[PDB]
Each structure stands twice: as structure tokens, then as C-alpha cells.
Amino acid sequence: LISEISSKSLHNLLLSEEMRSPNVREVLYSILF
Amino acid sequence: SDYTRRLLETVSVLLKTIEIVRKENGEVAEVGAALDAVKVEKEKLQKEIMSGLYRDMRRLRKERDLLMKRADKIVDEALSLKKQSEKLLRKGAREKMEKLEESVDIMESEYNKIWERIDEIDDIILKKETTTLSFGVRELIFIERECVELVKSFNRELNQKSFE
Amino acid sequence: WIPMSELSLQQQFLLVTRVVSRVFNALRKT
């Protein structure tokens, strides 16, 4: 866990730019399966 | 704060590299060396940041360990004096029971302040986690991304220059 | 934190590629 916090601070999520629901994510994962 | 200032000096040297490779058509590998110098200096400074962070969390976790070990010692004393009180109740020495219950009261008062110092340590290590990670490494990552985007922009500019 | 069950396919890709890139950088000094 030495570099895990550095990985946390590194990741670039500041711009979302997506613009649903978690059950929709469930069926998307099942469909991908 | 001085970490950001020194990396700002490094990226100002990188701006000088950009200037010289823009004026007299300098080698792009010079810009690569400049960006890699910013990279390795940011890396070693972030290593220094985690070195200081690990040093003081080791210090404060060692103090917290010492204090909970001492709390274990004090509750061991409480258990020992409680057993002495239980065995003394079968004898009938009331003059020593008052001293023993006062000894229990004082150790309970000490144990309360032990827990207070535990709570003081925990919030302090939490704040040390929050502030340093929220400012230092984030600012270094931001200036790294700004410098690599500037280098990419100039390299694509030189790509346009060479293709014309 | 913003836990792992909230990101997307490309964000999970960046997570897993950061993990394997850390493993790579740890293994390339051998």
C-alpha cells in the first residue's frame, strides 16, 4: 500500500463529460458476459 | 510548498528549452531530456514526500503503540489490584480497601486521558494524510501534466513545421 | 477514495493499466 495512495492521487477523473442506474450497469455487465 | 517552487524552477528551465528549440530549431530529444528531467525530479521529490510522511507516521504510530501498550499495562494493574481487593475482602482489612479503591480511581482517571491522547493522535495522522496528499503530490501531478501537454503541443507544432 | 464500483469501462481500463504499469516499472529494473 506504499504507492496505492499515489495511484489514488494520480488518476485523472476531474472532467466527467459523460452526461442512469446501477441495475442498468448489471444488465450491461450480463450482456457483455 | 518549496517542492512546487523547485519544480517550477525546473519547468522554467523546460520553458527555456522550449524557447531554444523553437528559435534555432533545437533537437526534439533535448525537449525529451527536459521532460524526463522534470519527470525524475518530480519522482524523487515525491519519494522525499513519502519518506517524510512515512517517517512521521512511523513516529506517531510508534507513540500510539507505546501509549496503548501503557494502557494495557494500566488495565493489567487495575486487574491485579481488583484481584487483591477480592482476596482482601475475604480477610477483613477495611483500612487498605480505601487505598486500593483510590488506586483504582486514579488509574481510571489516567486511562481516560490515555484515550484522549489516542483520539488526538488519530485525528492528527488523518490530517497529515489529507493535507499533504491534497496539496503537494496533486500540484506536482498537475504541473507534470501541464509540462507534458506543452511538450506535446510543441512537438506537434514541429511536426507541422517539418511536414510543410 | 471514491470506491471502485462507480467508474466506467475506460476508467476501469485506466485503473488496471495503472496497476500493470506499476508492476512493469517495478519489473524493468531487473
Side-chain angles (χ1 to χ4, degrees):
Chain A
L1 298 188
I2 296 291
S3 320
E4 199 264 344
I5 330 180
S6 160
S7 94
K8 271 195 212 199
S9 45
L10 244 198
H11 290 174
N12 44 263
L13 198 73
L14 298 109
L15 272 305
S16 93
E17 269 51 42
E18 177 260 347
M19 264 314 189
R20 271 178 315 219
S21 46
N23 72 332
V24 159
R25 205 78 164 101
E26 150 59 49
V27 280
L28 291 154
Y29 283 153
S30 193
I31 279 190
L32 251 182
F33 147 73
Chain B
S1 316
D2 230 349
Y3 313 76
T4 69
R5 288 151 185 158
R6 163 221 63 65
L7 201 38
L8 168 65
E9 287 153 73
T10 315
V11 303
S12 193
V13 179
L14 163 61
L15 307 181
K16 266 290 165 282
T17 71
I18 295 298
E19 274 186 53
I20 64 162
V21 302
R22 162 181 318 168
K23 289 321 161 304
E24 44 91 31
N25 273 345
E27 166 67 22
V28 298
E30 196 280 333
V31 199
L35 78 93
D36 266 4
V38 178
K39 266 186 175 191
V40 65
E41 213 150 45
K42 151 254 170 172
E43 264 218 326
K44 60 175 261 177
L45 270 277
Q46 159 273 328
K47 288 154 208 150
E48 293 159 34
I49 298 184
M50 82 184 108
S51 83
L53 210 63
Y54 292 155
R55 158 190 73 198
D56 74 306
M57 53 66 58
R58 267 179 259 210
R59 287 155 128 173
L60 246 194
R61 286 227 197 180
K62 179 55 205 164
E63 214 161 325
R64 205 248 198 266
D65 194 16
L66 278 165
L67 173 74
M68 52 76 88
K69 231 158 194 161
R70 166 155 105 90
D72 253 2
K73 180 210 188 322
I74 300 301
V75 302
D76 204 327
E77 291 161 30
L79 261 52
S80 315
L81 303 170
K82 258 192 295 302
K83 303 314 148 79
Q84 299 163 9
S85 284
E86 289 147 37
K87 303 319 295 177
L88 182 95
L89 189 70
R90 328 289 165 86
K91 320 295 194 308
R94 190 71 209 187
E95 302 92 298
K96 189 244 186 163
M97 204 185 187
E98 290 285 297
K99 171 254 161 178
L100 271 200
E101 65 93 9
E102 176 107 347
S103 85
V104 177
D105 207 325
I106 189 76
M107 63 65 50
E108 197 270 325
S109 312
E110 178 205 9
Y111 150 86
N112 292 315
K113 93 79 186 174
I114 284 193
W115 262 115
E116 303 316 316
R117 168 79 204 256
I118 276 172
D119 299 5
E120 167 274 349
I121 287 155
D122 202 356
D123 222 21
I124 279 191
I125 78 165
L126 258 283
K127 214 43 171 173
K128 228 86 181 195
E129 289 208 36
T130 57
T131 68
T132 60
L133 290 158
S134 165
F135 303 142
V137 54
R138 188 200 166 199
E139 215 285 323
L140 302 193
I141 291 163
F142 163 69
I143 199 68
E144 161 265 294
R145 289 166 174 172
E146 283 273 46
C147 86
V148 301
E149 84 92 18
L150 181 52
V151 168
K152 283 168 173 195
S153 67
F154 182 82
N155 225 334
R156 292 160 191 160
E157 279 170 346
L158 181 138
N159 168 39
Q160 302 140 16
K161 292 169 181 187
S162 322
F163 272 53
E164 290 172 285
Chain C
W1 193 26
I2 185 56
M4 82 305 296
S5 89
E6 283 98 295
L7 299 95
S8 157
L9 257 285
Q10 53 95 9
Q11 295 149 358
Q12 98 165 60
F13 175 79
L14 81 86
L15 302 164
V16 66
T17 202
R18 193 36 62 198
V19 176
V20 306
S21 198
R22 290 212 114 81
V23 180
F24 207 72
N25 255 341
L27 285 200
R28 290 289 77 64
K29 323 185 180 190
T30 46

